[PDB]
Structures are given as C-alpha cells and as structure tokens.
Amino acid sequence: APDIPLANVKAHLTQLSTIAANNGGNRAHGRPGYKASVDYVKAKLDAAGYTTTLQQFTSGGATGYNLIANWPGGDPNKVLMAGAHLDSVSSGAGINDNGSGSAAVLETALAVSRAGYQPDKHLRFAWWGAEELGLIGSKFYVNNLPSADRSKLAGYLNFDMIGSPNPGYFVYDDDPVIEKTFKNYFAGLNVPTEIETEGDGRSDHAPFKNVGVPVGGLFTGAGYTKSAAQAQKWGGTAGQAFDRCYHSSCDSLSNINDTALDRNSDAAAHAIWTLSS
Numbered sequence: 001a002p003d004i005p006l007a008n009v010k011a012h013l014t015q016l017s018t019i020a021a022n023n024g025g026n027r028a029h030g031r032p033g034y035k036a037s038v039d040y041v042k043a044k045l046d047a048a049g050y051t052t053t054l055q056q057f058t059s060g061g062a063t064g065y066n067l068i069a070n071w072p073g074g075d076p077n078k079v080l081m082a083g084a085h086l087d088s089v090s091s092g093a094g095i096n097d098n099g100s101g102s103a104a105v106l107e108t109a110l111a112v113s114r115a116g117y118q119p120d121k122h123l124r125f126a127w128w129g130a131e132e133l134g135l136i137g138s139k140f141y142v143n144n145l146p147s148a149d150r151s152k153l154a155g156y157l158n159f160d161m162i163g164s165p166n167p168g169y170f171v172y173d174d175d176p177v178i179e180k181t182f183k184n185y186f187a188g189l190n191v192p193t194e195i196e197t198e199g200d201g202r203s204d205h206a207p208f209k210n211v212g213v214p215v216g217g218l219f220t221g222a223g224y225t226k227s228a229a230q231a232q233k234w235g236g237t238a239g240q241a242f243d244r245c246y247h248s249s250c251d252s253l254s255n256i257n258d259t260a261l262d263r264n265s266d267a268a269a270h271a272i273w274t275l276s277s
C-alpha cells in the first residue's frame, strides 16, 4: 500500500473549513454547508474515475444525502467498503468530527486511482449524511440494500474522529480479522493501541454490525479524559480531554494533531489494500 501524503489530507480539511466559513459556519444536515461538502468530495472522485451515486433521504423535514463511490472492477460478490460521516453539528465546522475521517477516506480513494490499483475485491467508499441526528444516513443505506446485496459485503471499515488534538490510538474490537490488520500496522510503527470503548455503537458502523457485516475502525478519542498511563504511552497531556473542542465552535483547522491524522490515514490505506487482496 502507498504512504498517504499528510499534505493532501490537510488540503481537503482546508477546503472543508472554507466551505463552512462561506456557509454560516457549519456543515450540518439540512444547511447549505453540508451539500457544498458533498459537492467538493464528489467532484474529486468523478475526476479520478469513480462511478458516484447521490442517495437522497428526508430527516427532520430536510433533505440529506449519502455519497457512494464505486471503483470499477473487482469481484462483484465480495465488496469491501470504507466510510466516514460528512456532516458536522451546527455549532462549528466539524474539522476533527468528522472532516478528519472524511478526508482520510477521500485521499485513500484518490490514492487507489493514482496507483492504478486493481483489487481482487470490489472497492466501495461512502460519505454519510445526518450521522449527528442518530446515524440516519448509514441506517438509510443499510435499510435499503436488498438482502442479495447485503450478503456481498465482505466488511465495512469506519473512520470517525482520527485527528484528535491530544490523541489516543484506539482500534474497534469487532471483527477479529479487521482488528488484527489495524493492530499489526501500528505494531510496525511501534505505537501501542487500546480497544475502543468511548464510542461504543455510536457511529456509522453500527447499522452494518447489526445485520451481520464484519466491521472495524479507528478512533483517537473525544470528550473522555486521557489518563496518566495513556499520556506515558502516547504523549500529550494527562487530565485533559482527547478532544477539548468536541462538538464545539473551536473544532476548526487548529483542532487537529498532524501525527495522529497521518498515522491513521496511512493505517486506513494499509487496511484497504490488505483486505482487498
């Protein structure tokens, strides 16, 4: 797998920050900042050769969208999916929650095209809308997939908050194969990892997990406090939240730790290449 360039990931975050600033200060469901985010991501994917689909749904009286991108080729009966929610809360730009996961998945999708990669399994990427209203977009996608198509899903990888400013390195403890793939990557960098407990079933992997699709993912921490033991293994500040700007107006471009964002973006590409062989 390729090394994902941190500068390219940060460039997507800068574009999402500008879109929020030009649209009222946020990228929330039912507000212009969300559709403008979808448009930026879709344009990059269409230029790289992906087949893109906009799935529309209505929640809380407003139209939301999911963006689904399929890389042509691969085994249609074994699909590997990776995704991230693209909406923010209305209090701010949502750069770490979840511009960080959205940008890492977008750059990995662009890396597949730049590399001319032809995977054995078919690759599909998704950006979910309305996750902040209760996983509405990912629930809509799973509820609308016929059972014949659900059985073709080999796994779903989720990236939701992967650039926290005072980070931890947490790996989901769901499917064992996906979990091991991420743990082995971090072992090679000599970065320890811990099992994800803070989020639980509170992100877009839940609807997939509930219907039997193997799931996994990465997380760097939100409102919980980093312990002394955690600061010893990862650096940062003990006694302070992993993300002091969670759901706040200060979740902006300065609310990102570059080392964590780079390591998690690289880990995402490593898992996507490894599991699609």
Ligand SMILES: CC(C)C[C@H](N)C(=O)O
Pocket: 097, 098, 131, 132, 160, 161, 198, 199, 200, 202, 203, 204, 219, 222
């Ligand atoms: C609980 C954490 C993984 C983040 C949560 N899913 C959110 O979007 O706020």
Ligand SMILES: [Ca+2]
Pocket: 003, 004, 005, 006, 262, 263, 266
């Ligand atoms: Ca990198």
Ligand SMILES: [Zn+2]
Pocket: 085, 097, 098, 160, 161
């Ligand atoms: Zn989130």
Ligand SMILES: [Zn+2]
Pocket: 089, 097, 132, 247
């Ligand atoms: Zn959130």
